[PDB]
PDB file of all heavy atoms in Angstrom:
ATOM      1  N   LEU A  88      77.538  29.843 -47.989  1.00 38.61           N
ATOM      2  CA  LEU A  88      77.828  29.006 -46.829  1.00 38.61           C
ATOM      3  C   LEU A  88      76.578  28.146 -46.496  1.00 38.61           C
ATOM      4  O   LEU A  88      76.704  26.946 -46.217  1.00 38.61           O
ATOM      5  CB  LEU A  88      78.251  29.874 -45.613  1.00 38.61           C
ATOM      6  CG  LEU A  88      79.746  29.868 -45.265  1.00 38.61           C
ATOM      7  CD1 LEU A  88      79.929  30.471 -43.906  1.00 38.61           C
ATOM      8  CD2 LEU A  88      80.307  28.476 -45.315  1.00 38.61           C
ATOM      9  N   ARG A  89      75.399  28.773 -46.416  1.00 40.57           N
ATOM     10  CA  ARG A  89      74.194  28.049 -46.145  1.00 40.57           C
ATOM     11  C   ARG A  89      73.838  27.019 -47.294  1.00 40.57           C
ATOM     12  O   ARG A  89      73.302  25.964 -47.044  1.00 40.57           O
ATOM     13  CB  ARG A  89      73.049  29.015 -45.945  1.00 40.57           C
ATOM     14  CG  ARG A  89      73.198  29.886 -44.746  1.00 40.57           C
ATOM     15  CD  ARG A  89      71.998  30.885 -44.598  1.00 40.57           C
ATOM     16  NE  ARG A  89      72.177  31.719 -43.421  1.00 40.57           N
ATOM     17  CZ  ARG A  89      71.809  31.343 -42.175  1.00 40.57           C
ATOM     18  NH1 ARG A  89      71.229  30.210 -41.942  1.00 40.57           N
ATOM     19  NH2 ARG A  89      72.008  32.244 -41.198  1.00 40.57           N
ATOM     20  N   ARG A  90      74.189  27.410 -48.556  1.00 40.51           N
ATOM     21  CA  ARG A  90      73.918  26.463 -49.591  1.00 40.51           C
ATOM     22  C   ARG A  90      74.811  25.243 -49.619  1.00 40.51           C
ATOM     23  O   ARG A  90      74.366  24.166 -49.988  1.00 40.51           O
ATOM     24  CB  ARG A  90      74.031  27.189 -50.971  1.00 40.51           C
ATOM     25  CG  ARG A  90      73.024  26.823 -52.007  1.00 40.51           C
ATOM     26  CD  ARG A  90      72.832  27.841 -53.095  1.00 40.51           C
ATOM     27  NE  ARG A  90      74.106  28.059 -53.817  1.00 40.51           N
ATOM     28  CZ  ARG A  90      74.468  27.376 -54.933  1.00 40.51           C
ATOM     29  NH1 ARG A  90      73.643  26.509 -55.482  1.00 40.51           N
ATOM     30  NH2 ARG A  90      75.625  27.601 -55.518  1.00 40.51           N
ATOM     31  N   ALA A  91      76.065  25.407 -49.180  1.00 45.21           N
ATOM     32  CA  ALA A  91      76.929  24.249 -49.053  1.00 45.21           C
ATOM     33  C   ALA A  91      76.446  23.268 -48.012  1.00 45.21           C
ATOM     34  O   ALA A  91      76.490  22.085 -48.232  1.00 45.21           O
ATOM     35  CB  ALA A  91      78.369  24.716 -48.788  1.00 45.21           C
ATOM     36  N   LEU A  92      76.040  23.813 -46.862  1.00 44.86           N
ATOM     37  CA  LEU A  92      75.566  22.926 -45.790  1.00 44.86           C
ATOM     38  C   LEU A  92      74.349  22.156 -46.137  1.00 44.86           C
ATOM     39  O   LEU A  92      74.113  21.127 -45.560  1.00 44.86           O
ATOM     40  CB  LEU A  92      75.373  23.739 -44.528  1.00 44.86           C
ATOM     41  CG  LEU A  92      76.607  24.443 -43.899  1.00 44.86           C
ATOM     42  CD1 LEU A  92      76.251  25.286 -42.722  1.00 44.86           C
ATOM     43  CD2 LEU A  92      77.647  23.362 -43.520  1.00 44.86           C
ATOM     44  N   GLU A  93      73.518  22.739 -47.060  1.00 48.61           N
ATOM     45  CA  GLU A  93      72.327  21.959 -47.521  1.00 48.61           C
ATOM     46  C   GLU A  93      72.691  20.796 -48.460  1.00 48.61           C
ATOM     47  O   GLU A  93      71.910  19.853 -48.586  1.00 48.61           O
ATOM     48  CB  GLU A  93      71.344  22.924 -48.194  1.00 48.61           C
ATOM     49  CG  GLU A  93      70.451  23.669 -47.262  1.00 48.61           C
ATOM     50  CD  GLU A  93      69.512  24.694 -48.001  1.00 48.61           C
ATOM     51  OE1 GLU A  93      69.936  25.168 -49.011  1.00 48.61           O
ATOM     52  OE2 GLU A  93      68.438  24.909 -47.487  1.00 48.61           O
ATOM     53  N   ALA A  94      73.842  20.854 -49.108  1.00 46.84           N
ATOM     54  CA  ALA A  94      74.198  19.824 -50.087  1.00 46.84           C
ATOM     55  C   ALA A  94      74.483  18.517 -49.429  1.00 46.84           C
ATOM     56  O   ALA A  94      73.904  17.455 -49.800  1.00 46.84           O
ATOM     57  CB  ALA A  94      75.372  20.256 -50.914  1.00 46.84           C
ATOM     58  N   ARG A  95      75.397  18.488 -48.422  1.00 48.64           N
ATOM     59  CA  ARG A  95      75.714  17.286 -47.726  1.00 48.64           C
ATOM     60  C   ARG A  95      75.799  17.537 -46.222  1.00 48.64           C
ATOM     61  O   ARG A  95      75.407  18.608 -45.780  1.00 48.64           O
ATOM     62  CB  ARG A  95      77.012  16.690 -48.278  1.00 48.64           C
ATOM     63  CG  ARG A  95      78.232  17.718 -48.279  1.00 48.64           C
ATOM     64  CD  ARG A  95      79.545  16.967 -48.285  1.00 48.64           C
ATOM     65  NE  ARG A  95      79.904  16.519 -46.944  1.00 48.64           N
ATOM     66  CZ  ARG A  95      81.061  15.885 -46.669  1.00 48.64           C
ATOM     67  NH1 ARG A  95      81.916  15.507 -47.633  1.00 48.64           N
ATOM     68  NH2 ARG A  95      81.311  15.526 -45.433  1.00 48.64           N
ATOM     69  N   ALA A  96      76.357  16.588 -45.461  1.00 47.45           N
ATOM     70  CA  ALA A  96      76.444  16.730 -44.075  1.00 47.45           C
ATOM     71  C   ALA A  96      77.870  17.213 -43.677  1.00 47.45           C
ATOM     72  O   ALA A  96      78.819  16.910 -44.325  1.00 47.45           O
ATOM     73  CB  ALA A  96      76.191  15.381 -43.337  1.00 47.45           C
ATOM     74  N   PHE A  97      77.906  18.013 -42.594  1.00 44.68           N
ATOM     75  CA  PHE A  97      79.212  18.606 -42.110  1.00 44.68           C
ATOM     76  C   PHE A  97      79.096  18.650 -40.594  1.00 44.68           C
ATOM     77  O   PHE A  97      78.052  19.074 -40.009  1.00 44.68           O
ATOM     78  CB  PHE A  97      79.445  19.958 -42.727  1.00 44.68           C
ATOM     79  CG  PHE A  97      79.998  19.867 -44.145  1.00 44.68           C
ATOM     80  CD1 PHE A  97      79.178  20.072 -45.209  1.00 44.68           C
ATOM     81  CD2 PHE A  97      81.314  19.604 -44.312  1.00 44.68           C
ATOM     82  CE1 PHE A  97      79.657  20.022 -46.482  1.00 44.68           C
ATOM     83  CE2 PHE A  97      81.831  19.584 -45.634  1.00 44.68           C
ATOM     84  CZ  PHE A  97      81.020  19.725 -46.704  1.00 44.68           C
ATOM     85  N   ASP A  98      80.199  18.377 -39.897  1.00 44.05           N
ATOM     86  CA  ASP A  98      80.285  18.519 -38.497  1.00 44.05           C
ATOM     87  C   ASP A  98      80.269  19.971 -38.059  1.00 44.05           C
ATOM     88  O   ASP A  98      79.516  20.432 -37.257  1.00 44.05           O
ATOM     89  CB  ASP A  98      81.478  17.727 -37.907  1.00 44.05           C
ATOM     90  CG  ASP A  98      81.330  16.238 -38.054  1.00 44.05           C
ATOM     91  OD1 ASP A  98      80.181  15.759 -38.060  1.00 44.05           O
ATOM     92  OD2 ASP A  98      82.318  15.523 -38.156  1.00 44.05           O
ATOM     93  N   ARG A  99      81.222  20.710 -38.630  1.00 44.42           N
ATOM     94  CA  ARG A  99      81.420  22.094 -38.331  1.00 44.42           C
ATOM     95  C   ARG A  99      81.985  22.833 -39.515  1.00 44.42           C
ATOM     96  O   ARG A  99      82.176  22.270 -40.594  1.00 44.42           O
ATOM     97  CB  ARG A  99      82.366  22.312 -37.135  1.00 44.42           C
ATOM     98  CG  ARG A  99      83.675  21.542 -37.260  1.00 44.42           C
ATOM     99  CD  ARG A  99      84.744  22.075 -36.329  1.00 44.42           C
ATOM    100  NE  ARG A  99      85.847  21.129 -36.177  1.00 44.42           N
ATOM    101  CZ  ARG A  99      86.604  20.637 -37.113  1.00 44.42           C
ATOM    102  NH1 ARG A  99      86.372  21.028 -38.398  1.00 44.42           N
ATOM    103  NH2 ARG A  99      87.555  19.820 -36.851  1.00 44.42           N
ATOM    104  N   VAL A 100      82.156  24.157 -39.348  1.00 45.29           N
ATOM    105  CA  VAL A 100      82.731  25.021 -40.406  1.00 45.29           C
ATOM    106  C   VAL A 100      84.055  25.603 -39.769  1.00 45.29           C
ATOM    107  O   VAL A 100      84.079  26.057 -38.666  1.00 45.29           O
ATOM    108  CB  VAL A 100      81.820  26.135 -40.815  1.00 45.29           C
ATOM    109  CG1 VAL A 100      82.566  27.226 -41.595  1.00 45.29           C
ATOM    110  CG2 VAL A 100      80.656  25.548 -41.672  1.00 45.29           C
ATOM    111  N   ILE A 101      85.099  25.583 -40.643  1.00 44.58           N
ATOM    112  CA  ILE A 101      86.351  26.190 -40.222  1.00 44.58           C
ATOM    113  C   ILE A 101      86.696  27.267 -41.238  1.00 44.58           C
ATOM    114  O   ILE A 101      86.646  27.083 -42.446  1.00 44.58           O
ATOM    115  CB  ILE A 101      87.476  25.101 -40.197  1.00 44.58           C
ATOM    116  CG1 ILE A 101      87.060  23.954 -39.355  1.00 44.58           C
ATOM    117  CG2 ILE A 101      88.799  25.746 -39.688  1.00 44.58           C
ATOM    118  CD1 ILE A 101      87.560  24.031 -37.897  1.00 44.58           C
ATOM    119  N   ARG A 102      87.044  28.452 -40.749  1.00 44.46           N
ATOM    120  CA  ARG A 102      87.462  29.583 -41.565  1.00 44.46           C
ATOM    121  C   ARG A 102      88.591  30.313 -40.839  1.00 44.46           C
ATOM    122  O   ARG A 102      88.916  30.056 -39.733  1.00 44.46           O
ATOM    123  CB  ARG A 102      86.301  30.504 -41.872  1.00 44.46           C
ATOM    124  CG  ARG A 102      85.692  31.158 -40.632  1.00 44.46           C
ATOM    125  CD  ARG A 102      84.568  32.102 -41.058  1.00 44.46           C
ATOM    126  NE  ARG A 102      84.214  33.018 -39.990  1.00 44.46           N
ATOM    127  CZ  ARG A 102      84.889  34.068 -39.643  1.00 44.46           C
ATOM    128  NH1 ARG A 102      85.967  34.397 -40.313  1.00 44.46           N
ATOM    129  NH2 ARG A 102      84.475  34.842 -38.600  1.00 44.46           N
ATOM    130  N   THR A 103      89.158  31.313 -41.544  1.00 47.39           N
ATOM    131  CA  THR A 103      90.165  32.166 -41.022  1.00 47.39           C
ATOM    132  C   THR A 103      89.737  33.599 -41.082  1.00 47.39           C
ATOM    133  O   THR A 103      89.254  34.053 -42.094  1.00 47.39           O
ATOM    134  CB  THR A 103      91.514  31.997 -41.827  1.00 47.39           C
ATOM    135  OG1 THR A 103      91.640  30.616 -42.197  1.00 47.39           O
ATOM    136  CG2 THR A 103      92.667  32.468 -41.018  1.00 47.39           C
ATOM    137  N   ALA A 104      89.946  34.310 -39.974  1.00 49.98           N
ATOM    138  CA  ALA A 104      89.563  35.723 -39.892  1.00 49.98           C
ATOM    139  C   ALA A 104      90.031  36.482 -41.133  1.00 49.98           C
ATOM    140  O   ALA A 104      91.181  36.331 -41.604  1.00 49.98           O
ATOM    141  CB  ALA A 104      90.091  36.325 -38.570  1.00 49.98           C
ATOM    142  N   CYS A 105      89.187  37.342 -41.682  1.00 48.40           N
ATOM    143  CA  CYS A 105      89.457  38.082 -42.863  1.00 48.40           C
ATOM    144  C   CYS A 105      90.001  39.496 -42.530  1.00 48.40           C
ATOM    145  O   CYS A 105      90.256  39.817 -41.361  1.00 48.40           O
ATOM    146  CB  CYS A 105      88.253  38.124 -43.762  1.00 48.40           C
ATOM    147  SG  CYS A 105      86.799  38.878 -42.985  1.00 48.40           S
ATOM    148  N   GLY A 106      90.125  40.362 -43.558  1.00 49.78           N
ATOM    149  CA  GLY A 106      90.675  41.698 -43.349  1.00 49.78           C
ATOM    150  C   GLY A 106      89.671  42.826 -43.404  1.00 49.78           C
ATOM    151  O   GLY A 106      90.075  43.980 -43.673  1.00 49.78           O
ATOM    152  N   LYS A 107      88.415  42.462 -43.284  1.00 48.13           N
ATOM    153  CA  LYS A 107      87.322  43.475 -43.363  1.00 48.13           C
ATOM    154  C   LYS A 107      86.439  43.314 -42.126  1.00 48.13           C
ATOM    155  O   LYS A 107      85.844  42.284 -41.938  1.00 48.13           O
ATOM    156  CB  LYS A 107      86.469  43.332 -44.649  1.00 48.13           C
ATOM    157  CG  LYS A 107      85.336  44.329 -44.771  1.00 48.13           C
ATOM    158  CD  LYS A 107      85.059  44.647 -46.236  1.00 48.13           C
ATOM    159  CE  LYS A 107      84.520  43.443 -46.978  1.00 48.13           C
ATOM    160  NZ  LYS A 107      83.901  43.798 -48.312  1.00 48.13           N
ATOM    161  N   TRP A 108      86.412  44.360 -41.269  1.00 46.71           N
ATOM    162  CA  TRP A 108      85.655  44.231 -40.009  1.00 46.71           C
ATOM    163  C   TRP A 108      84.136  44.033 -40.368  1.00 46.71           C
ATOM    164  O   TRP A 108      83.494  43.276 -39.642  1.00 46.71           O
ATOM    165  CB  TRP A 108      85.829  45.580 -39.208  1.00 46.71           C
ATOM    166  CG  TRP A 108      85.199  45.417 -37.856  1.00 46.71           C
ATOM    167  CD1 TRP A 108      85.814  45.014 -36.708  1.00 46.71           C
ATOM    168  CD2 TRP A 108      83.869  45.770 -37.503  1.00 46.71           C
ATOM    169  NE1 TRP A 108      84.974  45.021 -35.658  1.00 46.71           N
ATOM    170  CE2 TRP A 108      83.761  45.528 -36.112  1.00 46.71           C
ATOM    171  CE3 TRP A 108      82.786  46.276 -38.168  1.00 46.71           C
ATOM    172  CZ2 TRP A 108      82.581  45.753 -35.408  1.00 46.71           C
ATOM    173  CZ3 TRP A 108      81.626  46.454 -37.474  1.00 46.71           C
ATOM    174  CH2 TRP A 108      81.511  46.224 -36.078  1.00 46.71           C
ATOM    175  N   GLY A 109      83.591  44.746 -41.311  1.00 43.64           N
ATOM    176  CA  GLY A 109      82.208  44.569 -41.636  1.00 43.64           C
ATOM    177  C   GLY A 109      81.854  43.163 -42.023  1.00 43.64           C
ATOM    178  O   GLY A 109      80.786  42.624 -41.645  1.00 43.64           O
ATOM    179  N   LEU A 110      82.735  42.489 -42.722  1.00 46.48           N
ATOM    180  CA  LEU A 110      82.539  41.109 -43.087  1.00 46.48           C
ATOM    181  C   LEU A 110      82.769  40.151 -41.951  1.00 46.48           C
ATOM    182  O   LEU A 110      81.944  39.320 -41.605  1.00 46.48           O
ATOM    183  CB  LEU A 110      83.462  40.751 -44.323  1.00 46.48           C
ATOM    184  CG  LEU A 110      83.184  39.331 -44.858  1.00 46.48           C
ATOM    185  CD1 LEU A 110      81.782  39.230 -45.351  1.00 46.48           C
ATOM    186  CD2 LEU A 110      84.183  39.059 -46.008  1.00 46.48           C
ATOM    187  N   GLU A 111      83.943  40.268 -41.249  1.00 50.53           N
ATOM    188  CA  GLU A 111      84.247  39.425 -40.194  1.00 50.53           C
ATOM    189  C   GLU A 111      83.192  39.539 -39.079  1.00 50.53           C
ATOM    190  O   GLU A 111      82.969  38.559 -38.312  1.00 50.53           O
ATOM    191  CB  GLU A 111      85.614  39.754 -39.587  1.00 50.53           C
ATOM    192  CG  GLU A 111      85.956  39.065 -38.294  1.00 50.53           C
ATOM    193  CD  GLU A 111      86.317  37.608 -38.444  1.00 50.53           C
ATOM    194  OE1 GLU A 111      86.523  37.189 -39.613  1.00 50.53           O
ATOM    195  OE2 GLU A 111      86.365  36.905 -37.417  1.00 50.53           O
ATOM    196  N   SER A 112      82.598  40.677 -38.896  1.00 52.07           N
ATOM    197  CA  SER A 112      81.490  40.830 -37.899  1.00 52.07           C
ATOM    198  C   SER A 112      80.200  40.088 -38.384  1.00 52.07           C
ATOM    199  O   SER A 112      79.566  39.324 -37.665  1.00 52.07           O
ATOM    200  CB  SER A 112      81.200  42.323 -37.671  1.00 52.07           C
ATOM    201  OG  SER A 112      80.250  42.454 -36.591  1.00 52.07           O
ATOM    202  N   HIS A 113      79.810  40.366 -39.640  1.00 54.88           N
ATOM    203  CA  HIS A 113      78.676  39.677 -40.193  1.00 54.88           C
ATOM    204  C   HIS A 113      78.808  38.174 -40.080  1.00 54.88           C
ATOM    205  O   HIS A 113      77.837  37.470 -39.771  1.00 54.88           O
ATOM    206  CB  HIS A 113      78.544  40.071 -41.675  1.00 54.88           C
ATOM    207  CG  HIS A 113      77.449  39.368 -42.417  1.00 54.88           C
ATOM    208  ND1 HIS A 113      76.104  39.457 -42.021  1.00 54.88           N
ATOM    209  CD2 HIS A 113      77.442  38.609 -43.520  1.00 54.88           C
ATOM    210  CE1 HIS A 113      75.399  38.765 -42.923  1.00 54.88           C
ATOM    211  NE2 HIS A 113      76.212  38.190 -43.782  1.00 54.88           N
ATOM    212  N   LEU A 114      80.041  37.653 -40.303  1.00 57.46           N
ATOM    213  CA  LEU A 114      80.194  36.179 -40.280  1.00 57.46           C
ATOM    214  C   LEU A 114      80.111  35.615 -38.912  1.00 57.46           C
ATOM    215  O   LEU A 114      79.578  34.530 -38.683  1.00 57.46           O
ATOM    216  CB  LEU A 114      81.522  35.804 -40.907  1.00 57.46           C
ATOM    217  CG  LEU A 114      81.704  36.024 -42.416  1.00 57.46           C
ATOM    218  CD1 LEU A 114      83.093  35.632 -42.860  1.00 57.46           C
ATOM    219  CD2 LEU A 114      80.619  35.316 -43.214  1.00 57.46           C
ATOM    220  N   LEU A 115      80.587  36.390 -37.888  1.00 57.95           N
ATOM    221  CA  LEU A 115      80.538  35.939 -36.519  1.00 57.95           C
ATOM    222  C   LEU A 115      79.103  35.747 -36.022  1.00 57.95           C
ATOM    223  O   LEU A 115      78.779  34.935 -35.158  1.00 57.95           O
ATOM    224  CB  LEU A 115      81.305  36.844 -35.570  1.00 57.95           C
ATOM    225  CG  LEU A 115      82.796  37.061 -35.780  1.00 57.95           C
ATOM    226  CD1 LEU A 115      83.310  38.247 -35.019  1.00 57.95           C
ATOM    227  CD2 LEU A 115      83.573  35.766 -35.427  1.00 57.95           C
ATOM    228  N   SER A 116      78.158  36.517 -36.550  1.00 56.07           N
ATOM    229  CA  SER A 116      76.792  36.508 -36.153  1.00 56.07           C
ATOM    230  C   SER A 116      75.952  35.479 -36.878  1.00 56.07           C
ATOM    231  O   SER A 116      74.823  35.183 -36.418  1.00 56.07           O
ATOM    232  CB  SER A 116      76.121  37.922 -36.366  1.00 56.07           C
ATOM    233  OG  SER A 116      75.858  38.116 -37.730  1.00 56.07           O
ATOM    234  N   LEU A 117      76.429  34.927 -38.003  1.00 59.86           N
ATOM    235  CA  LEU A 117      75.615  34.036 -38.805  1.00 59.86           C
ATOM    236  C   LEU A 117      75.015  32.922 -37.939  1.00 59.86           C
ATOM    237  O   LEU A 117      75.751  32.234 -37.150  1.00 59.86           O
ATOM    238  CB  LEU A 117      76.512  33.443 -39.899  1.00 59.86           C
ATOM    239  CG  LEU A 117      76.640  34.260 -41.161  1.00 59.86           C
ATOM    240  CD1 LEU A 117      77.339  33.379 -42.290  1.00 59.86           C
ATOM    241  CD2 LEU A 117      75.218  34.633 -41.654  1.00 59.86           C
ATOM    242  N   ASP A 118      73.754  32.666 -38.105  1.00 54.19           N
ATOM    243  CA  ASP A 118      73.045  31.540 -37.493  1.00 54.19           C
ATOM    244  C   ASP A 118      73.161  30.349 -38.409  1.00 54.19           C
ATOM    245  O   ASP A 118      72.551  30.351 -39.485  1.00 54.19           O
ATOM    246  CB  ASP A 118      71.616  31.935 -37.183  1.00 54.19           C
ATOM    247  CG  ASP A 118      71.476  33.257 -36.481  1.00 54.19           C
ATOM    248  OD1 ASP A 118      72.409  34.005 -36.429  1.00 54.19           O
ATOM    249  OD2 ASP A 118      70.360  33.562 -35.966  1.00 54.19           O
ATOM    250  N   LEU A 119      73.925  29.330 -37.985  1.00 54.79           N
ATOM    251  CA  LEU A 119      74.159  28.196 -38.815  1.00 54.79           C
ATOM    252  C   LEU A 119      73.739  26.912 -38.057  1.00 54.79           C
ATOM    253  O   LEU A 119      73.734  26.923 -36.855  1.00 54.79           O
ATOM    254  CB  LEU A 119      75.621  28.076 -39.204  1.00 54.79           C
ATOM    255  CG  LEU A 119      76.138  29.029 -40.191  1.00 54.79           C
ATOM    256  CD1 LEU A 119      77.597  28.790 -40.572  1.00 54.79           C
ATOM    257  CD2 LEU A 119      75.309  29.002 -41.511  1.00 54.79           C
ATOM    258  N   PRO A 120      73.381  25.852 -38.774  1.00 56.57           N
ATOM    259  CA  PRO A 120      72.955  24.625 -38.106  1.00 56.57           C
ATOM    260  C   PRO A 120      74.111  23.915 -37.400  1.00 56.57           C
ATOM    261  O   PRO A 120      73.913  23.049 -36.540  1.00 56.57           O
ATOM    262  CB  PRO A 120      72.381  23.781 -39.189  1.00 56.57           C
ATOM    263  CG  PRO A 120      73.028  24.303 -40.445  1.00 56.57           C
ATOM    264  CD  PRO A 120      73.240  25.751 -40.215  1.00 56.57           C
ATOM    265  N   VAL A 121      75.371  24.251 -37.724  1.00 53.00           N
ATOM    266  CA  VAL A 121      76.571  23.590 -37.141  1.00 53.00           C
ATOM    267  C   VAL A 121      77.449  24.648 -36.529  1.00 53.00           C
ATOM    268  O   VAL A 121      77.281  25.855 -36.809  1.00 53.00           O
ATOM    269  CB  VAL A 121      77.313  22.757 -38.182  1.00 53.00           C
ATOM    270  CG1 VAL A 121      76.437  21.649 -38.743  1.00 53.00           C
ATOM    271  CG2 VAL A 121      77.846  23.646 -39.295  1.00 53.00           C
ATOM    272  N   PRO A 122      78.378  24.264 -35.647  1.00 49.88           N
ATOM    273  CA  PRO A 122      79.292  25.258 -35.044  1.00 49.88           C
ATOM    274  C   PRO A 122      80.265  25.808 -36.106  1.00 49.88           C
ATOM    275  O   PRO A 122      80.517  25.139 -37.125  1.00 49.88           O
ATOM    276  CB  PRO A 122      79.984  24.462 -33.955  1.00 49.88           C
ATOM    277  CG  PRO A 122      79.195  23.220 -33.764  1.00 49.88           C
ATOM    278  CD  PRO A 122      78.556  22.945 -35.110  1.00 49.88           C
TER     279      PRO A 122
END
């Protein structure tokens, strides 16, 4: 995810909640330059 945002410009990131709590929690905490 961080490597994609470095390639070009993006306003935000859109995703769909997954089926693994450990993953969906890790993703909610990610510090990203965009919303």
Side-chain angles (χ1 to χ4, degrees):
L88 256 193
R89 296 179 179 275
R90 216 160 63 91
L92 296 176
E93 276 176 331
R95 54 157 278 180
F97 282 99
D98 291 332
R99 51 162 162 56
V100 165
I101 308 265
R102 62 177 197 80
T103 321
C105 58
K107 180 150 65 167
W108 188 92
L110 186 58
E111 169 77 12
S112 186
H113 176 61
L114 291 182
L115 298 166
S116 76
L117 272 188
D118 310 13
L119 289 182
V121 299

